[PDB]
Amino acid sequence: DLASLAIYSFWIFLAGLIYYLQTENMREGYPLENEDGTPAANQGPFPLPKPKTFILPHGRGTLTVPGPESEDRPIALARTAVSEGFPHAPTGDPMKDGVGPASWVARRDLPELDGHGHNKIKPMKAAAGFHVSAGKNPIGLPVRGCDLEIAGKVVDIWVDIPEQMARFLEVELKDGSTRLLPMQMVKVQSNRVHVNALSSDLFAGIPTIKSPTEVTLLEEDKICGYVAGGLMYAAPKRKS
Template identity: 45%
Template sequence: MIFSGEFVNGIDLVDVCLWAFMIFFVWLIYYLQREGMREGYPLEEDPSGRQEAPGLVFVPPPKSFNLPNGRGTIEMTYGKADTRDLALNRTAPWAGSPFVPSGDGMKDGVGPASYAMRADVPDLNWDGQDRISPYRLNPDYTVSAKDIDPRGLPVVGLDSRVAGVVTDLWVDRAEAIIRYLEVKLDGSGVQVLLPVPFANISKSRKRVEVAAVKAEHFANVPRTKSPDRVTRLEEDMISGYYGGGTLYATPQRQEPWL
């Protein structure tokens, strides 16, 4: 007998396919909603910080994540909450009201100077080697003859005062680009890192110009624990410090334009 579209009497193949698709689609929505709640939940009330009850339906189960380069595994349900006590004061009691720094915004890491609490370990390449490393440990890297080598050039802040001199370059070995300039500060001899996006290497003036901060601010740039390595957390803290200078370096920058 030729198949007429029925498995047995009263069961239609079209109905079976339709219901199977609907069941799968509902399950997919539930799964994506549940997995999407691993970060940013449970919700918190803005003024008080009170956490909303997570509910019963969409709570994701614990999940194990394998870390690369033999750094073990971590198990979590929700992403780790940021519990830092930030040096900020609310300008009004209602939700969504702006905050103002209660101290030095650049040092306290708030506003444009804020940073994420990344893992305090170096970023590694696929082979387990440090991704970002100074030139002195990588003799095969050189500066193109078409570009000016910033090593030996003075570094000046937005006040046109000299903060120090560039002593080395830190290269991203995964992408073969320079990420940081190493600056030796005048007077103290302390070495700090300067992210390349904040540096303008002037060929005509033969100096490195930094518009984000003053010369005096270089003394408070977050340090690295190792002279030859930088961790993910340290990278965020350093970039956040210079980013904070774009607003907090001078009182005039914090005033409205209009």
């Protein structure tokens, strides 16, 4: 019967599809590890796929995955139990150490480029023809942490040029230096910007950028990591 053939065949196909799909999704993070970072004994029944290479634009090279995995950074954590499966306690200050929900990845310390090879994210002051078009302009608002104190003031928006969207607020601190705050982690209010994730005393510890008119992917990850980490680790100084 032709329909029985068609459906029997379909299942075989779908089984192969799921296999393919699952192996394609092991191109990062595998082989699996023990908690000391050595290779685990039980890797699962799906083998790692044959590698593929992405050619990256703008002379930035290639990425071949799967490949040798490696954190390329220290991880300030220690076991809290004598067996597998328990949490790992920060050995210092987790916000400073970039562990836990304050974690960052050792991405390239270069900026994301656009299609023309220009920096993707620029402060609006340096972004020809870019201006706030709708909504409350943050620039000039005082910035408030979850301790209900003022940590600083908004001095610019950092904008994605090709996608024409706001990505960070640049905030000047009491000492005159600035930091970036992810736009996704701030509430622009009529008369302030409020930052739930961080108490005012924690703003100085936001990682800083090495050149004041661009950010690197490494720098983004540290900044975004740090600020998200506050949800867990600033909670004592939070009053919500």
